[PDB]
Amino acid sequence: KAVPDKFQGFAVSDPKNWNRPKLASYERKQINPHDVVLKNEVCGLCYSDIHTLSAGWQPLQRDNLVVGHEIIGEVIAVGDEVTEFKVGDRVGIGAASSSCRSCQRCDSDNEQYCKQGAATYNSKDVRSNNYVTQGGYSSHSIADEKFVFAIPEDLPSSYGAPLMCAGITVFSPLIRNLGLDARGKNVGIIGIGGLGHLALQFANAMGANVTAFSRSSSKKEQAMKLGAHDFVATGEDKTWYKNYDDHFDFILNCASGIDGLNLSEYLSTLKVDKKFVSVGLPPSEDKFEVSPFTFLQQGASFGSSLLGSKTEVKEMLNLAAKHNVRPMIEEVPISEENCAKALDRCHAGDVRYRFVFTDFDKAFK
Amino acid sequence: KAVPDKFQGFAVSDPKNWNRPKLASYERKQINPHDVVLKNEVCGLCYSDIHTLSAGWQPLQRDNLVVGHEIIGEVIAVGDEVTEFKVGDRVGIGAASSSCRSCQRCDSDNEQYCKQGAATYNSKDVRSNNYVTQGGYSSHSIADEKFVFAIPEDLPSSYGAPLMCAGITVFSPLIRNLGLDARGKNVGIIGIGGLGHLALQFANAMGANVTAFSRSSSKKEQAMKLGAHDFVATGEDKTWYKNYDDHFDFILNCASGIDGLNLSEYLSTLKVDKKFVSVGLPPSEDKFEVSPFTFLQQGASFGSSLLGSKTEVKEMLNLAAKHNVRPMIEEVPISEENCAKALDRCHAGDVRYRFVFTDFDKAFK
Ligand SMILES: NC(=O)C1=CN([C@@H]2O[C@H](COP(=O)(O)OP(=O)(O)OC[C@H]3O[C@@H](n4cnc5c(N)ncnc54)[C@H](OP(=O)(O)O)[C@@H]3O)[C@@H](O)[C@H]2O)C=CC1
Ligand SMILES: [Zn+2]
Ligand SMILES: [Zn+2]
Ligand SMILES: [Zn+2]
């Protein structure tokens, strides 16, 4: 076989050592007819890697677990039923890897919402020997065909990797709630991190009037460069909603704190029958209180959004290359000392705006 | 001589006496150039009246508070800028009475969502020197012509009274989330009461598969003949949600409270990016509970809907005369005792499905 029986990746097993992963060797996942095998070249650092490594939402489902789900690599092998990719193709893998392939979500462009699906890391894929999936801090990654995305040749590897998760996580609710042509529509982006910095460019490229939201004005100058048309410092202008009455056609909360948030203020600026969508929030199960009076005077709604569809990924890469929508990244050659450096900085938000791991040929044998 | 200076009505001034309304005479509101003066003939009982009188949402905003917001009356006087109604017309008044007449929502068929709007009762009208509005349990009513609705000469007044609030409040979220052509859509209505029993009829006229939701097996076939294609009792089938996985296109909640309302279970049955709209308003201290893990699996939404448009009222009355959409009422001659009898009965669920007060001349003239 052209695929080794063991992969190499930077992994942890004790959640106390979430920030200091060590190199480990683990057996591969079984390759089913609809699976694609990659040789990883780059893998962006998503914040949900820190969510899962520290076991803040759910414990670790395996020992020597490799995270990272912003993968871009080269196909070295495919299943006997794969028809969209051949050996040598440059493709990418997001935060999900397996699906039902027989439900209704998979047939109606919603495979990322399939109840029997498996994530890229820390997930038991019942279709593959109930293997706890391994992420992209690895030498190689395996995924189903509908979660493998073809990379255009004009989009470089190190810059298309953050789009495999962070990009699609903010693009999916934008196109679904604003339409691909968002001209004449006012959109709102809360929090300018790895998710927010990409949402501003995509919303701007779609033609919407973008408003960047944060507590301070520390990121005002940088958000205006990223495509925001105005800025609001929710900590400095505490009564900012007075100048935004009946304005926003949609508001996207990009992983901003759902502890110090004031939904009453953001909802007071929505149009009628609009929605407030939160992405990148940690998947915790403690129920919060909800009242209908919070959305009454605007007909508004509150909801979540996870990942996107494969057809949305294609339209995202098409729009990203058409409008030159690239994420600001900090390249970091993958290594035991380098992963601990970026994870320590990414947890504190000390990045502008996405850590991308490179030079996989130098780290793994 | 045309309009008296004081109106008569059955009012309450202490929240402890919510179910013992007294007959009192209060100074009427000023008649502004767009206002319509009615001689009330009928008025339905809506559970918002109980919540208002019981201070379940907020304290009484005035002394001697007349409630009721399903008025069918005869025009006895009009302003000078009125163009739609003349003296002697039979018309209706819902739960809203005025709006700013200068926003975009007032010109975009959303005058019910006006920021400076004033309810029919228990609300300060900034266009009438902050006069707290008075309801329809009264001799006369005053409302802006944009919130006064004409009644067809075929519809009886007592049968058309519930449509001024109960009908429009369920018709508007239905027409906006389904359209008039809801062929194939799956609708779910919770709380088969005043609004619920009408929502089953309107959703049936849309051509959509209706699934009624009750707390017990009572009102079962009563909802079947109304228009519900399916029926589930919340208190019995504790695991009903397992059979509705990815089935509902829209869920409208018309319940008065939260006892027996599992929001996480209702969100489990929605399709991806579908809305859970709640027109029902429990007491402010009562709230639904749902975990963030439920919002993310379906990508669903939770929201509210406040009343409806005037153009939607004209539409609602059109499809009413087409599919014989008529409420089930119980006419009550208005009194100090019959009101208390209806207040105590309706609070305990002893009505199918909406009380309508009649015989106003024997109580006022
Ligand atoms: N948003 C708006 O613009 C409007 C909102 N409303 C709100 O709509 C709601 C219903 O109005 P109405 O239809 O007059 O009320 P009804 O009492 O006429 O219908 C109430 C139904 O809700 C269910 N229910 C009763 N008690 C409870 C409880 N404690 N917890 C949960 N469900 C319960 C029952 O259905 P079952 O027995 O089958 O469960 C009952 O039939 C009210 O809360 C009112 O405030 C009213 C007018 C307009
Ligand atoms: Zn991610
Ligand atoms: Zn599936
Ligand atoms: Zn207005």
Side-chain angles (χ1 to χ4, degrees), chain B residues 251-268:
Chain B
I251 298 203
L252 184 57
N253 169 38
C254 312
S256 324
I258 66 172
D259 281 71
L261 255 288
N262 195 164
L263 183 48
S264 324
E265 284 175 0
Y266 280 106
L267 296 174
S268 298

Side-chain angles (χ1 to χ4, degrees), chain B residues 55-182 184-215 217-220 223 226-237 239-290 292-318:
Chain B
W57 300 330
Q58 60 179 351
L60 294 323
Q61 304 300 305
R62 70 161 295 153
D63 288 324
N64 304 129
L65 183 35
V66 191
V67 302
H69 53 200
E70 294 188 302
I71 308 135
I72 316 307
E74 181 190 319
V75 180
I76 66 169
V78 278
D80 276 11
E81 297 312 306
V82 50
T83 82
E84 302 312 74
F85 307 111
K86 66 180 92 33
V87 166
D89 283 356
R90 189 172 65 109
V91 281
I93 292 177
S97 283
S98 65
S99 65
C100 89
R101 275 180 170 266
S102 64
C103 74
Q104 179 86 330
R105 305 182 167 186
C106 277
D107 206 15
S108 318
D109 300 330
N110 266 327
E111 59 277 356
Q112 70 278 20
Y113 288 105
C114 172
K115 182 176 53 179
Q116 293 177 338
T120 286
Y121 52 80
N122 199 33
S123 177
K124 307 173 66 216
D125 185 9
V126 304
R127 289 160 302 281
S128 308
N129 300 279
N130 276 227
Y131 178 88
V132 180
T133 56
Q134 295 275 58
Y137 292 178
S138 45
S139 38
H140 305 84
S141 269
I142 304 174
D144 192 271
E145 77 163 326
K146 186 171 329 203
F147 294 90
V148 178
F149 318 114
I151 305 299
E153 305 201 343
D154 297 316
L155 177 58
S157 289
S158 60
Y159 264 143
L163 289 204
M164 297 309 108
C165 184
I168 182 58
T169 313
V170 293
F171 175 79
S172 187
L174 277 177
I175 188 69
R176 292 183 179 198
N177 301 282
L178 270 46
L180 258 189
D181 44 357
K185 313 295 220 312
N186 299 312
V187 201
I189 286 91
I190 318 166
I192 313 301
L195 277 68
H197 97 292
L198 271 161
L200 304 167
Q201 311 178 50
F202 286 109
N204 183 289
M206 310 273 174
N209 302 120
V210 189
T211 296
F213 286 99
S214 147
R215 287 186 300 171
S217 289
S218 323
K219 321 171 200 171
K220 194 165 191 176
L226 275 177
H229 303 114
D230 204 331
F231 195 95
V232 179
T234 323
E236 291 132 52
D237 200 10
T239 46
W240 69 267
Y241 49 90
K242 301 174 178 175
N243 314 356
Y244 288 78
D245 216 288
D246 191 76
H247 170 86
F248 281 99
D249 287 285
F250 184 43
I251 298 203
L252 184 57
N253 169 38
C254 312
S256 324
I258 66 172
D259 281 71
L261 255 288
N262 195 164
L263 183 48
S264 324
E265 284 175 0
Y266 280 106
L267 296 174
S268 298
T269 73
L270 276 173
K271 291 183 231 177
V272 190
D273 274 80
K274 299 307 176 182
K275 297 170 64 180
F276 181 103
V277 177
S278 167
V279 291
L281 298 176
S284 96
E285 70 161 352
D286 288 358
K287 285 152 129 64
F288 312 103
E289 301 198 34
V290 60
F293 187 73
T294 323
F295 276 130
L296 182 100
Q297 294 200 144
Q298 318 288 285
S301 323
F302 175 90
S304 291
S305 171
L306 175 59
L307 305 180
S309 148
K310 174 171 190 170
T311 62
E312 291 167 333
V313 153
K314 292 169 185 167
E315 202 45 29
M316 181 203 63
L317 293 177
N318 290 2

Side-chain angles (χ1 to χ4, degrees), chain A residues 87-97:
Chain A
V87 173
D89 285 325
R90 190 165 136 269
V91 303
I93 297 177
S97 314

